[PDB]
Design an enzyme around this catalytic site. Structure first.
Site, short mmCIF file in Angstrom:
data_model
loop_
_atom_site.label_atom_id
_atom_site.label_comp_id
_atom_site.label_asym_id
_atom_site.label_seq_id
_atom_site.Cartn_x
_atom_site.Cartn_y
_atom_site.Cartn_z
N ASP A 70 -10.00 0.00 1.43
CA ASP A 70 -10.27 -1.29 1.07
C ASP A 70 -10.08 -2.64 1.93
O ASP A 70 -10.28 -3.49 1.82
CB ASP A 70 -8.71 -1.06 0.31
N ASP A 102 0.91 -1.14 -0.04
CA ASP A 102 -0.03 0.06 -0.06
C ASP A 102 0.83 1.34 -0.25
O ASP A 102 0.44 2.44 -0.05
CB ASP A 102 -1.00 0.07 1.08
N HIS A 140 -8.76 3.04 5.43
CA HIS A 140 -8.92 2.71 4.27
C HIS A 140 -10.48 2.25 3.88
O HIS A 140 -10.55 1.02 4.75
CB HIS A 140 -7.87 1.83 4.34
N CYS A 178 0.55 -6.21 4.02
CA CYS A 178 0.46 -7.36 2.91
C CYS A 178 1.16 -7.07 2.45
O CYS A 178 1.11 -5.90 1.26
CB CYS A 178 -0.87 -7.52 2.11
C1 LIG Z 1 -5.96 -2.27 11.22
O1 LIG Z 1 -5.85 -4.11 11.00
C2 LIG Z 1 -6.43 -4.52 10.21
C3 LIG Z 1 -6.25 -4.65 8.40
C4 LIG Z 1 -6.65 -5.00 7.25
C5 LIG Z 1 -6.78 -4.60 5.92
O2 LIG Z 1 -7.31 -5.06 5.48
N1 LIG Z 1 -5.34 -4.18 5.95
C6 LIG Z 1 -4.43 -3.62 6.83
C7 LIG Z 1 -4.13 -2.36 7.54
C8 LIG Z 1 -3.79 -1.68 5.69
O3 LIG Z 1 -2.94 -1.59 5.33
C9 LIG Z 1 -5.86 -1.96 5.20
N2 LIG Z 1 -5.33 -0.84 4.10
C10 LIG Z 1 -5.63 -2.95 4.82
C11 LIG Z 1 -6.74 -7.02 7.66
C12 LIG Z 1 -6.56 -6.80 9.12
N3 LIG Z 1 -6.52 -8.29 10.21
C13 LIG Z 1 -6.29 -8.13 11.19
C14 LIG Z 1 -6.37 -9.53 12.03
C15 LIG Z 1 -7.05 -9.58 12.90
C16 LIG Z 1 -7.12 -10.66 13.32
C17 LIG Z 1 -6.92 -11.41 14.17
C18 LIG Z 1 -6.21 -13.29 14.78
C19 LIG Z 1 -4.81 -12.89 14.08
N4 LIG Z 1 -4.80 -12.46 12.87
C20 LIG Z 1 -5.82 -11.27 12.86
N5 LIG Z 1 -5.93 -10.54 12.07
C21 LIG Z 1 -4.57 -9.79 10.84
C22 LIG Z 1 -3.04 -10.11 11.79
C23 LIG Z 1 -2.26 -8.70 10.92
C24 LIG Z 1 -2.57 -9.06 12.59
N6 LIG Z 1 -6.68 -6.76 11.63
C25 LIG Z 1 -5.93 -6.09 12.85
C26 LIG Z 1 -6.73 -6.21 10.23
#
Ligand SMILES: COc1cc(C(=O)N2CC[C@@H](O)[C@@H](N)C2)cc2nc(-c3cc4cccnc4n3CC3CC3)n(C)c12
Ligand SMILES: Cc1c(C)n(-c2ccc(Br)cc2)c2ncnc(N3CCC([C@H](N)C(=O)N4CCCC4)CC3)c12
Length: 596
Positions: A411, A308, A409, A578
């Site tokens: 997205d 991003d 965001h 990501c």
């Molecule tokens: C703000 O928190 C998030 C943003 C985005 C997203 O869609 N993003 C990312 C941010 C920006 O780049 C956006 N543009 C796109 C995705 C997410 N998934 C989780 C999540 C929840 C969870 C629960 C247990 C184990 N793991 C878990 N995870 C995954 C792990 C990283 C923690 N969280 C907390 C997210």
């Protein structure tokens, strides 16, 4: 097509000499010096001159339109001649002479937007840029790179000058090419040495005008024009290059313009690709690599290995389409320098091509995140960014509500996937309601003991999740936020409900009651054609299969989409990241046939 030109005042005292540029209409002034004892007049000219009388004998009425055109360019100074006879009731005819020199001055560019350089006389108005499949006006590309071979000129736009003049013609005239001072820092013009050189710049910054060195006779010379700046709040995107014929035959008096002609260029805007566009290459940056390499194989798409912080668009012209990478730091590359949380390409999605209560957006519409009203504790995307996206016009941005999210965001609760029916696609919205409906159905069967967060260090049971009344109100508030954006997307993209699919997703509030994914955010998937890379939700496992993955397959698989759940889709920097971008095929629709 023929445009207007010069007025020639003829007089019986001294003969009159004049240049005429093929393609212009030249009117004739007969009465301003006509004799008093004369009541009528007659016209007689060389076979190369075409005369036309409006409103072969004619009277000396002031309102007679006498106009001349040239059949072909001269070979000598004064080739064609015209003779006005004035006669009267008892007056012998009194002659007034006019020596004309015809000259061709065609400044041609790809006005028709067909990829072939056509002359300005093939369009009604050359000094105007009109959108759409019936419009006129050439197109420039921006130089996006941080002797000139043919390879450097493949991106530039061709502009030719054809002159056909008597052998001695540029002893007394000169041609100058010029750009308006205000547009000069946004263009650069090279002169083809025939193949050009890095020091062949004729026009460009700090140089608004240039005297062409043209020899008499038949001569053609080529120019190459690149653009130096995208459209912006202070640049609408038009650059008009003009050529002027100056008369320098008098040595004491200043130059005298006898003719101007111009072409209008529009700088091609920066255009983004929706997830519905077919993917050309996937960039990635650790066991999740195998899952995305499988995906890439199945979708017959390329996968290179090394976020991003950059976005991969393109710029397009009838002769070339080049992909341009934009990067906001914290071939073809462009950067920006200052910083709010919503100033991220992560806050920038693109609908598929859509049509909204009549208006057509064939390159889609850009969606960006915002607050719902400006407050002291509200964030917004920086004005300069909002305006720059609006300045490219062809993807008419839409302001959504994302400030409710911790990071902010769009997205995070929004995505598109290809579909083979209806408008050809589907909107995906995160849905706490859809998650709660599923978890209750699992408790209604006795599986409330099933655990979420399985496979990770602390877990939770469906029973404690479903009964948390503090969390229910969080997701009830979130559900309201996403619903607001839903009515907004239905209005600005003109969607029906049958175009929207709700992906079950739970949220939790963090600092300042801002929202955040409870489990990995599955709406923010990796769309590669009919193959979806979805973040593994790690939901409660009922009948050895995740019951959240079961729902999402039951929603997407009927569209023909292959769901592949990636384990480590997101990574936590002790911030959530990501490591995946996707270059996609640009729209077949040519942006210039739009009418914004
Ligand atoms: C703000 O928190 C998030 C943003 C985005 C997203 O869609 N993003 C990312 C941010 C920006 O780049 C956006 N543009 C796109 C995705 C997410 N998934 C989780 C999540 C929840 C969870 C629960 C247990 C184990 N793991 C878990 N995870 C995954 C792990 C990283 C923690 N969280 C907390 C997210
Ligand atoms: C670069 C840029 C970016 C990434 N972003 C952005 C947009 C959305 C998000 Br989300 C995040 C960042 C901009 N926004 C607003 N202005 C921008 N400039 C565009 C370039 C322009 C410059 N003079 C030009 O035309 N050049 C330089 C090289 C040759 C062409 C100056 C203004 C940008």
């Amino acid at each position: 097509f023929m445009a207007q030109g010069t007025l020639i005042r003829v007089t019986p005292e001294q003969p009159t000499h004049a240049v005429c540029v093929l393609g212009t209409l030249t009117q004739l002034d007969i009465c301003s010096s006509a004799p008093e004892d004369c009541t009528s007049f007659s016209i007689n000219a060389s076979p190369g001159v075409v005369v036309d009388i409006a409103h072969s004998t004619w009277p000396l009425d002031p309102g007679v339109e006498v106009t001349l055109t040239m059949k072909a360019a001269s070979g000598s100074t004064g080739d064609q001649k015209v003779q006005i006879s004035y006669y009267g009731p008892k007056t012998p005819p009194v002659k007034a002479l006019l020596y004309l020199t015809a000259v061709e001055i065609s400044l041609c560019a790809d006005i028709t937007r067909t990829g072939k350089v056509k002359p300005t006389r093939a369009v009604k108005d050359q000094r105007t840029w009109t959108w759409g499949p019936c419009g006129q006006g050439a197109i420039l590309l921006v130089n996006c790179d941080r002797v000139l071979d043919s390879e450097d000129l493949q991106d530039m736009s061709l502009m030719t000058l054809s002159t056909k003049t008597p052998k001695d013609f540029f002893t007394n005239h000169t041609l100058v090419l010029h750009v308006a001072r205000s547009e000069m820092d946004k263009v650069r013009v090279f002169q083809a040495t025939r193949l050009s050189s890095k020091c062949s710049v004729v026009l460009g910054p700090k140089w608004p005008s240039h005297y062409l060195m043209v020899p008499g006779g038949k001569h053609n010379m080529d120019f190459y024009v690149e653009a130096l700046a995208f459209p912006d709040t202070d640049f609408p995107g038009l650059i008009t290059l003009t050529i002027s014929l100056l008369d320098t035959s008098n040595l004491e008096l200043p130059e005298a313009v006898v003719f101007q002609d111009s072409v209008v260029f529009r700088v091609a805007p920066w255009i983004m690709t929706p997830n519905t566009q077919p993917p050309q290459e996937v960039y990635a940056c650790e066991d999740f690599l195998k899952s995305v390499t499988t995906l890439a194989m199945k979708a017959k798409c390329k996968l290179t290995i090394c976020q991003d912080e950059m976005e991969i668009g393109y710029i397009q012209a009838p002769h070339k389409t080049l992909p341009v990478v934009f990067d906001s730091p914290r071939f073809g590359y462009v950067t920006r320098g200052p910083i709010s949380g919503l100033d991220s390409f992560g806050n920038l999605e693109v609908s598929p091509p859509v049509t909204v209560r009549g208006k057509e957006y064939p390159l889609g519409r850009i969606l960006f995140g915002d607050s719902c009203y400006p407050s002291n504790d509200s964030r917004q995307m920086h004005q300069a960014l909002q305006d720059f996206l609006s300045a490219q016009q062809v993807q008419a941005p839409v302001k959504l509500y994302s400030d409710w999210l911790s990071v902010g965001h769009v997205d995070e609760f929004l995505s598109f996937v290809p579909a083979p029916d209806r408008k050809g696609f589907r909107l995906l919205l995160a849905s706490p309601r859809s998650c709660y409906k599923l978890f209750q159905e699992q408790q209604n069967e006795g599986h409330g003991e099933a655990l979420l967060f399985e496979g990770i260090k602390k877990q939770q049971k469906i029973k404690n999740i479903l009964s948390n009344k503090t969390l229910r109100e969080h997701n009830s508030f979130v559900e309201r936020c996403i619903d607001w954006n839903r009515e907004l997307l239905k209005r600005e993209l003109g969607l029906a409900e049958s175009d929207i699919i709700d992906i079950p997703q739970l949220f939790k509030l963090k600092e300042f009651s801002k929202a955040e994914a409870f489990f990995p955010n599955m709406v923010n998937m990796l769309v590669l054609g009919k193959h979806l890379g979805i973040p593994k939700p790690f939901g409660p496992v009922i009948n050895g299969r995740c019951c959240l993955e079961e729902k999402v397959c039951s929603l997407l698989e009927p569209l023909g989409l292959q769901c592949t759940f990636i384990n480590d889709f997101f990574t936590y920097h002790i911030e959530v990241h990501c490591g995946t971008n996707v270059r996609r095929k640009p729209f077949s629709f040519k942006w210039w046939n739009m009418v914004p």
